[PDB]
From a paper:
[name] ([name]) is a dimethyltransferase that maintains [name] homeostasis by catalyzing dimethylation of two adjacent adenines located in helix45 (h45) of 12S [name]. This m62A modification is indispensable for the assembly and maturation of human [name] ribosomes. [name] was originally thought to serve as a transcription factor along with TFB2M but has instead been shown to be a dimethyltransferase with the main role of m62A modification of the 3′ end of [name] 12S [name]. To clarify the mechanism of m62A modification, we determined the crystal structures of a ternary complex of human (hs) [name] (hsTFB1M–h45–SAM) and a binary complex (hsTFB1M–h45) both at 3.0 Å resolution.
Comparison of these two complexes revealed identical fold conformation of hsTFB1M and h45 appearing at an approximate 10° rotation only in the stem, possibly formed by base stacking. In the structures, the ‘GGAA’ tetraloop of 12S h45 flipped out to interact with hsTFB1M. The C-terminal domain (residues 237–324) contained four α-helices (α7–α10) that likely formed a scaffold for other functional proteins. Electrostatic potential surface maps showed a positively-charged region located in the C-terminus of hsTFB1M, with interactions formed between Arg183, Arg256, and Arg257 and the phosphate backbone of h45. Conversely, in the crystal structure, the four nucleotides in the ‘GGAA’ tetraloop all flipped out in order to interact with hsTFB1M, either for anchoring or modification.
Author numbering: 33 to 325
Amino acid sequence: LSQNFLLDLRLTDKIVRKAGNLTNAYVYEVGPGPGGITRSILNADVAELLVVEKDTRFIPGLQMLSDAAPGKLRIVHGDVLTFKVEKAFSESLKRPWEDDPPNVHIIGNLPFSVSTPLIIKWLENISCRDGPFVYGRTQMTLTFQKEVAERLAANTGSKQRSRLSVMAQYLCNVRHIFTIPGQAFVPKPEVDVGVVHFTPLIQPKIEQPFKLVEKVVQNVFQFRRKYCHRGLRMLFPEAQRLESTGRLLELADIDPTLRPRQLSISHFKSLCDVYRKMCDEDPQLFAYNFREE
RNA sequence: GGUAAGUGUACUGGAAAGUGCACUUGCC
């Protein structure tokens, strides 16, 4: 539940500029409380604004706008996590993948406790081209915490280079655009808020299943300041770990003295592609959870 | 020594913050 509100008509209006030209668009907004952005979206001449809101306190104020803008704002009382936007718009709007993005957009100012699990849920959806991505390469404009925004957009060798960097950037073009200060919200939180734009890639930079990249990225990054080989080890049961780790790094041409923050997405394609071949040869390797064995 | 803030720093795929460490400022 949200307890810090963005109501500056200057900042909500600037968020919807960064989403692009929406002048006949079908927009799905997830966050809206006081509808600050909601008002900003409707003044952009969208075709429809679909809006989901769990908190009932905000729905009378959203109806306030479904009448000041008749035939423009569809309201839904619901949970953005259970809600299926795959069926919220017509099949006529579905563009192919190797086309341009569709006329469907996601804009969102969720609580960070909702938006952080959800961006990963949506990243898996991009992988499977289902979910919000039945329409094609649906773009999304979301608010994360200043720090989380930088991790999604971080390049190699930087300090915010985390798991979220690779899980996002291999599937999406990611632009951390600007950062609103906490003082602009009401009441003020003890954090700053970043704004990030996602555009799904026609060809992902790793073509492996999402759960496979997940596992490689999770193990590379689990020991954070150390040699990246400290983490890649744990993909392999102890009995084969010495030989399977050396074979992994050598075939992928990875320097084991590299740190997790130093590995390009190219390095992950090589690690993932070779790890994919190891699981094809040993059908019971992929399930090795080192945490107990 | 115990404690609580603040600052810096490290980490977080469950970040409107949290935790470790260092220093500073107060207190017991």
